[PDB]
Symmetry: C3
Subunit: 244 residues, 3 copies
Amino acid sequence: HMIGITQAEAVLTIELQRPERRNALNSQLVEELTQAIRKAGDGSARAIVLTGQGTAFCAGADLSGDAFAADYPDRLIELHKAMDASPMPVVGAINGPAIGAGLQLAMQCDLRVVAPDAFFQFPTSKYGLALDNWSIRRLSSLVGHGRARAMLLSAEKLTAEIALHTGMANRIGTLADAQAWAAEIARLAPLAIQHAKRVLNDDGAIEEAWPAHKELFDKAWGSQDVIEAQVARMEKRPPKFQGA
Amino acid sequence: HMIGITQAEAVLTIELQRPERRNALNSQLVEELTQAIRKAGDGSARAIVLTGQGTAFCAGADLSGDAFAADYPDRLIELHKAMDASPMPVVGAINGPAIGAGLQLAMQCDLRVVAPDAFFQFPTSKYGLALDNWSIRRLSSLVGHGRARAMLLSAEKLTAEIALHTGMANRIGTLADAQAWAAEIARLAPLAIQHAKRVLNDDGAIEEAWPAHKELFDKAWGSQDVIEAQVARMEKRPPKFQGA
Amino acid sequence: HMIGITQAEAVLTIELQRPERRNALNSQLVEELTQAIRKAGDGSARAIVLTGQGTAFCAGADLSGDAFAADYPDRLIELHKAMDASPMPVVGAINGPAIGAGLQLAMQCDLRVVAPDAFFQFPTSKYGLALDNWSIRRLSSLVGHGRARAMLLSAEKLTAEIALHTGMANRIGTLADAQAWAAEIARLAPLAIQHAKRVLNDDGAIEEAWPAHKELFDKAWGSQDVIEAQVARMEKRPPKFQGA
Ligand SMILES: CCc1ccc([C@H]2C[C@@H](C(F)(F)F)n3ncc(C(=O)NCc4ccc5c(c4)OCO5)c3N2)cc1
Ligand SMILES: CCc1ccc([C@H]2C[C@@H](C(F)(F)F)n3ncc(C(=O)NCc4ccc5c(c4)OCO5)c3N2)cc1
Ligand SMILES: CCc1ccc([C@H]2C[C@@H](C(F)(F)F)n3ncc(C(=O)NCc4ccc5c(c4)OCO5)c3N2)cc1
């Protein structure tokens, strides 16, 4: 009910379909993507393309209304496991902005074809929040350590031009471009692709948070600044953080 | 009988001399390269330039009509060991294409001066094969993870301009260019260079394969798809891989 | 006495004020720096800008006239610990060349805004010296492994232009630019920044040197070539290294 699924030749295209919220994730959306990724190759498909409907790829996470929001973080982890564990290459057609949870998602794709007006952002420094280590490690691997510092420490937007520069984007193109490419890849030797993907993903980025990292994480998440940042956002005013 | 070794100033130039197979590696050539790396600086030389004769640096591996062809994987590991252990900086003059084993050898150099019309490639995904972890890790560090994903998951070529971009190439230039640069390096303090090499090479790229990596590596190498890739090539036709 | 410290808005600007020596790091300047960083946030400041007076950011370590040389490394280390431990983002306003220790100090900043005439260099291979692992890892993460090899193995200069390209420079700008950016960062949630800073700094660059690394490190440092570099410099001539 919240995603689209079409197959052409050997390419499964999975389309996020919640444009009314710029494809922000929730319990139901996340759980359907998961079933969809798991059930691909069932199936003569040999490559997956992932994309958003409308103007965004995925603008983050919106749990308003969501009855199982408590379950969301767990379902989200399952979704990333499901992708990571997939023997099928996932080609992200990043049709528009990919922010926060959406950025994580885009980064969990195996390759990325980015629309010219797309951008990537972790606005965590604006919301007093904190990321898991993987998000940071993978981000670093894709934009270089230096830019990752700017992105995490100052909510810097990574434009499409620069994503291509750093390697975040493999290509600047459209959904069609990404489907063409996915079809080439569908004709390649699956086991070779299975191997490379497993090793690539095992580059270290999947890291358990050090003891001090969990501290700072929890401290950030339980802070009053977290509440201040939301009220500010809602009021369309600058936030006045207290560092607590 | 299969390579050329000349020395000028304090620069040893080792040339692969099998242009009739585009300098494709085999038992003998690997053995002779190993010897030449070790016997280097015996000898007053403080720097090595490694290059290929003809249009290509090294197009892959051959073995066709190769008497001691079974201990070739072994002799190739010896070569990489020798190069990694040489107290001498090795400047690769990548005069042309560097593919598969050729790309490995190119990466095992300490510096790279790339000709405009050279490209690098791991076509393992087109042939149903799997690489060793180091090939993957070093590649990632030289082209960036993002671009490494494209080269490995879809057999994408790395052109010279892009090599310069990411740092795979330090310079775009000729053999002569590389040799002149090597002469400068020959006048720097050996012990400084020797320390830096060891540490740089010890960045973790030299990684034992995880269980899952050995398993997938082995499935691929013993797969039917490997035969299918070759017979399809021999029949000048699209391969139809089973994933097995 | 040796650094200037001002605060505007919520930004602490610390200026290295030894331009007569191109801001090279002497035992005392190091301590004053260390103290200034620790004592920051004491303090309504939420961000630090670290810059140099005159034409150079920092031309390296001093030691000339130092009656207590042996203690110098421990002070330089202390300074890095202080920066690494600071909950405050340090934006380096790299107003000119950052060489050796200068480059280390620039790399321990959290973000770098670089002047168009500036450049970064480890001329260690010109002096028979060797670096600690962190300098090597962090450098590789900032300019890419390929360019890290060139810089370390041949003393290659990283221009502002290419620092921007690789991520070593987040921006090309003036001190004032760096200060405007810092002011912004100062209005972001500190706890978010503190977390990302810790995790980022814990990417592995902070590495205990391996047995072989110490061995080579000591070997270079204790070498005769180290003296020869100093002598040739003074005698205004090309060094003549021996590898011992
Ligand atoms: C196995 C493949 C894989 C699995 C999960 C991830 C990421 C995904 C990503 C998200 F779901 F948000 F997108 N994500 N988010 C949270 C986690 C995650 O790993 N959470 C567990 C956790 C517990 C305590 C912590 C902590 C993390 O950080 C500091 O203290 C986590 N892990 C990334 C890759
Ligand atoms: C110590 C310096 C050094 C030594 C060797 C290498 C690479 C070279 C590169 C090549 F020889 F092909 F060029 N290469 N190829 C194979 C190996 C290699 O290390 N092979 C052993 C091995 C056994 C089982 C495996 C496995 C690897 O991968 C998954 O399952 C290997 N090691 C790279 C660096
Ligand atoms: C915890 C944050 C942090 C602390 C220190 C460093 C760097 C700084 C950098 C400098 F101070 F020069 F700028 N630096 N210099 C020396 C050290 C340093 O760590 N020295 C200890 C050491 C002992 C024996 C060794 C060895 C290192 O390398 C090979 O053999 C060292 N550590 C880098 C990051």
